[PDB]
């Protein structure tokens, strides 16, 4: 009946009781279309973002917020000052991991600052099926136990899945976001120039350029990278057959 009452009674979050065609030919097309993974170790605070070319169709931004650590983080002061509009294509999309606190507001300020409008709010809902006992340490301003995170999707320029990702809450000190966000993004078929800022060795993925301070190796070459999108491949969605 009342899963909220049940959570109060037992510590099992309401999301613990949610139960769960061929979208795989599309996934196969995405895979054939993907560029080789490319990646660059870079200290984004000291890095001139403009050296990342060409302009991107999709930017996934995952700055390491302090709230992710209950065991160098980026403040929204730092994040807001990134020059994301300088590397986004005039028609492009952004997916910004905002956490669960003040980022839900300041992430919207960032989106508007960089020229986007928010078009979706994707919620990563965390179950606790394996640790009903472990209570949560509350942020001082919090009214409720925070059991989710938000990834905001923004669009700039002119112009399937659900806006929910449900997984078990990761082990403490694990900051990784669900890989399912990549699936949602790639299924939109938004183009092939895809940047993941503050990615890690563990998130490197075909079809993506990954830029972050903790990468152990680099293979990025701006001229090589641009060559993946030169004619006749300039406007492929990443969901169509490669051009003969």
């Amino acid at each position: 009946n009342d899963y909220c009452q049940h959570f109060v009674d037992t510590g099992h979050r309401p999301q613990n009781f949610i139960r769960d065609e061929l979208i795989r030919l599309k996934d196969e097309l995405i895979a054939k279309s993907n560029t080789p993974p490319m990646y660059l170790q870079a200290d984004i605070e000291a890095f001139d973002i403009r050296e990342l070319t060409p302009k991107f169709d999709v930017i996934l931004l995952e700055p390491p917020l302090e709230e992710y650590y209950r065991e160098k983080c980026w403040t929204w002061d730092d994040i807001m000052k990134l020059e994301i509009d300088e590397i986004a294509a005039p028609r492009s999309f952004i997916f910004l991991w905002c956490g669960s606190g003040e980022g839900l507001d300041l992430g919207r300020v960032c989106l508007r600052k960089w020229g986007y409008r928010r078009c979706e709010d994707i919620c990563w809902i965390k179950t606790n099926k394996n640790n009903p006992g472990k209570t949560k340490t509350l942020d001082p301003k919090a009214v409720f136990q925070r059991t989710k995170e938000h990834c905001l999707m923004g669009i700039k320029g002119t112009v399937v899945d659900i806006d929910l990702i449900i997984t078990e809450e990761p082990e403490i000190g694990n900051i990784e976001k669900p890989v399912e966000i990549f699936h949602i993004i790639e299924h939109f078929c938004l183009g092939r120039r895809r940047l993941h800022l503050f990615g890690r060795d563990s998130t490197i993925r075909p079809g993506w350029l990954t830029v972050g301070p903790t990468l152990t190796n680099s293979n990025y070459n701006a001229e090589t990278y641009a060559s993946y999108f030169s004619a006749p491949n300039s406007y492929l969605t990443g969901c169509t057959e490669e051009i003969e």
């Binding site: 009342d2 899963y3 909220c4 009452q5 959570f7 109060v8 979050r13 309401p14 999301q15 009781f17 949610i18 139960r19 769960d20 669960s100 839900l104 507001d105 919207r108 928010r118 078009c119 979706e120 709010d121 994707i122 919620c123 809902i125 949560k136 509350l138 301003k141 919090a142 009214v143 409720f144 136990q145 925070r146 059991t147 989710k148 938000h150 999707m153 399937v160 899945d161 659900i162 806006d163 929910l164 949602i184 939109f188």
Partner: protein, 201 residues
């Protein structure tokens, strides 16, 4: 005081100063996002929400571009957004039931004004899993979380419907059936402000 109370009215024109102060305000506005009863963005900004509370919480349901407009109103009215509840909408078998993604949830902003003392913060979590009822019917679970958060206190709901009336709550909306007031302080101030029982612009 304690049993359900309500006022059929146009919330744009009611003098809400007669209602006193509330520990919790909840609103489910007819935002102008694409309808009868819709309020324009300016009408929502101008609602006299600030007189309703000194220290307490506001629960503001939002969808589409009111995700942003509701945040504007929340701040204009004097609140800081400190939480965001999402209701995951299910069918009777607990399966999940914006032109880029299908929508599995509704959002409710949680704002704070002043420094509320004696609330039971952290008893519930910020995800509701509950069955969809009629069109635009919010889940009754929210009243339980609000009661555990602030037991026994005075609460006010804006843009509610008859099925929303609850003990400890005063409900306002233009599809309610007449006026039903039991709190003597509110009855007194209502009769003085509205001696003929009519609420006009």
């Amino acid at each position: 005081l304690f049993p359900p109370q309500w006022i059929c009215c146009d919330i744009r024109y009611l003098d809400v100063s007669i209602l006193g102060k509330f520990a919790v305000v909840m609103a489910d506005p007819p935002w102008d996002i694409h309808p009868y009863g819709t309020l324009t963005d300016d009408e929502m900004r101008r609602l006299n929400i600030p007189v309703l509370q000194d220290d307490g919480f506001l629960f503001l349901w939002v969808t589409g571009r009111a995700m942003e407009l509701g945040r504007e109103c929340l701040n204009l009215w004097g609140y800081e957004r400190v939480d965001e509840i999402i209701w995951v909408k299910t069918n009777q078998l607990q399966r999940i039931i914006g032109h880029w993604l299908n929508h599995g949830k509704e959002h409710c902003l949680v704002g704070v004004k002043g420094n509320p003392q004696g609330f039971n913060q952290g008893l519930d979590c910020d995800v509701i899993v509950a069955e969809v009822r009629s069109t635009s019917h919010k889940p009754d679970e929210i009243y339980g979380m609000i009661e555990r958060l602030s037991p026994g206190t005075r609460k006010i709901e804006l843009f509610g419907r008859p099925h929303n009336v609850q003990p400890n709550w005063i409900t306002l909306g233009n599809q309610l059936d007449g006026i039903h007031l039991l709190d003597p302080d509110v009855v007194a101030r209502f009769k003085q402000r509205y001696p003929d029982g009519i609420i006009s612009k």
